[model samples]
Target chain A: DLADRFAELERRYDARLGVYVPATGTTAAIEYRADERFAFCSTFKAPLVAAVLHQNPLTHLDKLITYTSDDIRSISPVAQQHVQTGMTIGQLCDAAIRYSDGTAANLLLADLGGPGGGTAAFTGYLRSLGDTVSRLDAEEPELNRDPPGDERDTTTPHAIALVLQQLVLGNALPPDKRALLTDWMARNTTGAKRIRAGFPADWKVIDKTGTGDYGRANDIAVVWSPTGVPYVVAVMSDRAGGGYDAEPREALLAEAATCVAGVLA
Target chain B: DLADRFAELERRYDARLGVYVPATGTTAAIEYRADERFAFCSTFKAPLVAAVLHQNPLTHLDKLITYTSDDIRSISPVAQQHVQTGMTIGQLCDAAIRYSDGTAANLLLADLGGPGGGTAAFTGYLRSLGDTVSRLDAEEPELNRDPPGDERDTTTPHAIALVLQQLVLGNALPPDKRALLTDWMARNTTGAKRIRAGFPADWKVIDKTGTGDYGRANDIAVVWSPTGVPYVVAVMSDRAGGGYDAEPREALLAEAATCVAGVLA
Candidate 1:
């Protein structure tokens, strides 16, 4: 019945939708096109930063990294201010994950190898954590191409959701690193109007969001129920032949999230 | 030096200001007009809800309470939807603390004794916690009168900041209730462009906000520094002659918060 509800939602919004809500002991998991591919967009930054933490020392967080004029992007709100003063590795990670700063992501990617070959380095880290469906083939703007029929930089809903679970709930990284990444996600300023709008006022949520061309609007989150059980919910979407304007797409994601909440209840 | 900086900020914003940042081992506390009186507005809900938790059993949260048509208010975003269906004590408390729902506050006020006597009851709870400066003389809209030279529902910056520390960091409430109150403050959706905008992308913040007729814009928060030290920051402001627009007032608050961050660093 929930699947049918989601199908009706996809048609109502005239977009393809993929959602995955994992089982939480008290309730069975719900999936609708959970295995389908959609562009990762900036959502990759969450895992990218997590992978950086996994491969480096906590002391490495204090290592300052400088960026050139060419590294600047249109949406680097946090890093754009620090181009001259530069930022620490921890600051860059925080910028990338919490604020979705493009330049900040590029700077951190350079540590793995740079956008040139960091794709493979990052993918290697993902594979190490048992994530086989996710991929990051290029850098920020280029990676956001997200055209129809191309699987270049993408992931299925369930795959990204599991990665979130492993990093936050499981032991993918040490306790300190795990706690740091979770803190950043919980403080994210971007997801308030999306899936977060669908949640109860008191339920704690740790989430990452991504938006790009083709009406792509996505949010992945781990929410704690009132009784203290934790569950992971991911919603990914894209319009057919691509479209602009996010108001309707964002609304669809919210509606999808409301469905997930209903099923969890 | 920091005091001078804050004084300049007060002049620049053309508003009366109050700020209190408590010592955090590494940095000495900074205060400017910290003892001056200002309207509590809705910011009182944070302590009000904390008081409810303090006085009741945890199971009291599950009791369902119904509201009549007369109980509704203009800002009850969460409770407005459940007027017919009713809401649990926990839901009402969440609505009041997280969304500033006035009706929910009124509903909870009934538990202490309604609007007529709840003010004294709430004040009694504050006194028990050793807070002498905060007073809740009325409920919601009436409480927010906040006219010139009145102290019906008011608090000095230092006083409320101390109350916040006791509830979140000190031993005022039991561990579980303390965590619940802290979680609600952390998930608050209202304070983004206020003091929070001035904080770094990664620092965790737990806050409550208040707004009213006299150009009053206020926020009280506990921010965790990058090195894991915690400090309380309270900013309260109001324009003379009672103005309306909040854009400039909010900007002033953000600028004031930036000053706090610089001093903390």
Candidate 2:
């Protein structure tokens, strides 16, 4: 009944509904083109932060870095909000995760030797975490739509949840590092409407929301039910029929999140 | 010598160039990737107005049509500038050509039974003039890109030059209609940088500039030399390398237009 309702809601919006909720013991998925790659957009920031923390420990996390106009080639609201004259690596990671800041991501990549090395590190790190398909190849998340040596920055709903799972399980990141990752994603203010919208106030959702080119909105979450049950979710919305209208997409994600929350008992 | 100079000039930018310059009595043509199709963008307005006039002359051109908010979609500086409450079809055509007004173009199409009839009329009129390769299938020039069927609107340089030739020769349109079309283009001010940039101050350029998504720029012109040598020219720039940088593109168009002016004896 929940699946049917979601399908109906998704059809009306022209958005694909992808659900991967890892249950208490095992997980069942509603893989609507989950293997089919959707442009992940800023959602990749979550995994990227995990990778950086994995490679380097608490030593460099506090090291401050400066950014110029070149560092911010595209849109990054958080970087603009904060006077980006100089900030610590921890702060940059926070901006990249909490705000999905393009400038912050650029600064992180510069530390890893710009786009080529940065994406290589990202791909390598994600593959290590059992997410081989979801990869980043551009400096800014915006260019990931038409990335170099790749069609687009893409991931399966399954791949994203697995990354979230690893982060939650402390497999991809160390104890202290993953804690930072978890806190940042939980407190994220941007992308408040979609996956977070449907859940009841008591349930905890740590998610990274992504808005892609051609009207794609995605929210990947590690959801903890109020009864102490936890599951990972990745719902990607595609504007298959409509060119771009955000309300439908936001509503579709919320519906899916709500259905998963309501029916998973 | 000119080819060498043109080759050197074009090398600085990463784009394809197509130019069709048909000289007076003895037709000497200059074609650079003239066979390759480029996203024609707003250039379609030139031929579109021709189609509307060819089908229904003097009657609908003066009929004052009122526009709702939805009627004129996408970018329309002229339409918005002149509060789009109501205006004659002739005024709409002027704004469409002179201002590259998206709203005016939409209004033009709405009269002909929306997109289907409008583009059918466009391709039909174009084919009648022996310019068959260029095509249009979208209602809004904005939506023409990533459209219902086709991948935006497209035209070969050769195809557009033929359309210009027909307009100049009074073949595609009738006597009085052709005269009006020619005069409108001559007095046009919207796309002044491309083919218009190359010519002497005294020389006249009757051209439509097309700005396509993903850095495609084109100018189709009927250039009148000071010595009375008239030529139909189509200059198109494709961004095969740099993804959507307007400055280099506009610069490239201007440079190519300048070179074409210098070389074509």
Candidate 3:
């Protein structure tokens, strides 16, 4: 029934969506549309944060650091204009993951060493963990000195599903690192009303949402139920010129997430 | 004599070189390597400079503005360690184009909106000027960002040649803008001694040099002679380690410039 609902919703939005379900610590279900590469948006920060925490576990979470106007200026326009603050790297990481604060992410990126250092370090860690498809190759041009002029950075639904599996199974990082990442996801702000709109109010869904005007509209999440069933799901849409405020667009996404959660449940 | 000498130097350095020549509003000479994209070190600045000039003319070159530590941090690792003064957009542009100042360029990039805005505007300008082969698309991470990474931006020698032709002909920009661009090029500090090293003492050469060490070494320039035969020259080398400081390398570039100038003469 969930699969049927998802198929219908996919037709409505004209989007390619993917779902990953983990049962008993094993990847039990998966689905996607065309083996294509789509934009990762700020979702790329998840692995990046994990990498940073892994490297500097002993560092204080509340250590303060100032973000100058140039730091704000150097990030994506959407991020630069909206987020500004002085906080510890740990708090900044939480703000980035939970609130999807672009400014917070940019600061963390610098702390992580910009795109090359941060992204490279993240990719290297992922590879070391045995997830080969996950890569951090593309730099968002808005924040880069010499940004690549391609459409955007690309990642496969399959690869993202693998990342979720690693996260749920605790294979990608140490237990404490995994717990911190999961805790952050529990507080992600983007999907509450949109991606999780259709879920029952009591359902706990940990998710991240990515929106791009010229690229993909993506939401990846972990859906868990009181009955102890947990699953990973990702909805990716190529929404070009459909307008950012379209409710139907979000409904379509919610439909996909609900359908996937129902199936796994 | 210069052509023969250049050919000898080319054989010695074992690098591919492209040359462009212009005279009285015409591209008189052009050449290239095996039709592959080369790492366009700082040579990418020509179009960037063009884009800035097109958007903001010389009259506004000195308007004061705020620049934070993050702004200068890209160029100087110690930028965050102290307070720095902001410059008018105009002065920043001068430092970037004339001095090849990394801080100025990064600041300009922020002012222009971002890498995407700058590249798109620059490429569009080039297209309007009838440059079919040249396009400005990749970001050079090393020069622009703090964290260095493995992935890099790319452009072709052919595309760069077209850009040089437009600059030499003064057809790509208004007379004043063109003059300013040329003035800056004449004053560029980096790679000056190297590009002009092989030329005769009496010859006058106005050029720009770009280099990056991301598995490829590249230098592109437009050379002018006292004899009034203007030529566009680009040298792109792949996997030639120690290529930048290799004496034979600079001599090869100079020899190529001299060869094109001699041929035109």
Q: What is each predicted model's overall lDDT from 0 to 1?
A: 0.81, 0.71, 0.57
lDDT of 2 by residue, B91-166 (tens): 8888788877777887787666544847676777778888768777775644434421244477888888877888
Select the stronger candidate by TM-score from 1 and 2: 1
What TM-score results for chain B when candidate 1 is compared with the true chain B? Answer: 0.95
Candidate 1, residues A155-183, lDDT tens digits: the string is: 98988888888988999999989999999
lDDT by residue (A1-265, candidate 2, tens digit) is 6567767876777666666665445545555556667767778888888777877867898898876645554445445434445778998899888767777787787676645847777777788877767777666745444521245577778788777887976466767887889999988855567788889988888888776545567888887778867778888866645443332256678877887777664
Judge the docking of candidate 2 as incorrect, acceptable, medium or high: incorrect
Q: Please report, as a residue range, the 10-residue window in candidate 2 chain B with the lowest summed lDDT.
A: B143-152
| Native contacts retained, all candidates in order | 0.00, 0.00, 0.00
Q: Order of all candidates by lDDT, from best down to worst?
A: 1, 2, 3
Candidate 2 local distance difference test against the native: 0.71
**lDDT score, residue B37, model 1?**
91
Worst 10 residues of 3 chain B by lDDT: B74-83
**What residue pairs clash in candidate 1, if any at all?**
none
Show the lowest summed lDDT stretch of 10 residues, model 1 chain A: A240-249
DockQ of all candidate complexes: 0.02, 0.01, 0.01
lDDT of 2 at A128: 86
TM-score, chain A, per candidate?
Answer: 0.95, 0.89, 0.79
The total number of steric clashes, by the backbone 3 Å criterion, in model 3 comes to 16
